[PDB]
Design a protein around this nucleic acid. Structure first.
Ligand SMILES: [Mg+2]
Ligand SMILES: [Mg+2]
Length: 132
RNA sequence: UCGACA
DNA sequence: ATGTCG
């Protein structure tokens, strides 16, 4: 039932809102495929959203049909909607993450993909493989 | 009034 | 504790 031939993504933070990073790993091997440099201020859900969209772009660039696992129901909805409905304040500290979010939404509105975005079933399978 | 994803 | 949706 775990689709091993997949990319798993996860966010990591220090505080929330606080410093956010994310990474994508091969679900089978645990090899780290991408890891975003820490963003100074962001939310968990923004980060989880950026991680999925980063995965889509990564797989589309590489002509891969693998699905993406996320454990974030929110992020999965935001990607489906092409809209990150975050209520993080806008200021000079949050301008970088909000610009990345806006750019990700714009990517979603300008590209197609068939990548299935699947919910990692933590209750049954343990932590997602990209966890921090 | 919670419940749930983390 | 906090960000989010059902
Ligand atoms: Mg996650
Ligand atoms: Mg995690």
């Amino acid at each position: 039932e775990i689709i091993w031939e997949s990319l798993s993504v996860d966010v990591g933070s220090q505080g929330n809102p606080g410093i956010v990073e994310y990474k994508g790993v091969d679900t089978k091997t645990g090899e780290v495929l991408f890891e975003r440099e820490p963003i100074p201020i962001g939310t968990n859900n923004m980060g989880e959203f950026l991680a999925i969209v980063h995965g889509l772009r990564y797989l589309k660039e590489r002509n891969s049909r693998k699905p993406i696992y996320s454990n974030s129901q929110t992020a999965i909805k935001w990607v489906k909607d092409k809209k990150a409905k975050s209520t993080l304040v806008r200021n000079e500290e949050t301008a970088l993450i909000w610009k990345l979010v806006d750019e990700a939404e714009e990517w979603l509105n300008t590209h197609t993909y068939e990548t299935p975005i699947l919910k990692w079933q933590t209750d049954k399978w343990g932590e997602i493989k990209a966890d921090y």
